[PDB]
Amino acid sequence: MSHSVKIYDTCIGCTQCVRACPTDVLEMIPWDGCKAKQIASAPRTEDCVGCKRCESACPTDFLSVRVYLGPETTRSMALSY
Template sequence: MPIKSINGCIGCEECIKSCPTDVIRLNPDSKKAEILYPEDCQICHLCRMYCPVDAIVITPDKSIPVIVSWG
């Protein structure tokens, strides 16, 4: 699983909105983000970058460097 955890989630849904593969969903009971489809994660880092409280941890073995295009 590329995304290790979402500890400290405040339920802002920024990770859910930023995920292009719809891997992260809001748990209706806890009102916090959950990783429901880890096998579909493309390791784009958008969820991690948009999280305002740095709650998302991506495992080092799956982490790839973020590439920025200066176009």
């Protein structure tokens, strides 16, 4: 909600975005719309720093996890002080 992270239906369940979140935002939930039978999910968008590496590892036509930068909070700005 600080930043908005959205995952579409193109996702093929490869678990490459989840493994690449450096602050544990995304996670994997069951589906039935792929051969792998699992689609990603973003239930902890607060801590989302905005580091687009989460979607530099989604290998689809355009993309299946997308990140929109909104307002910035004290943790979405990664302030240590």
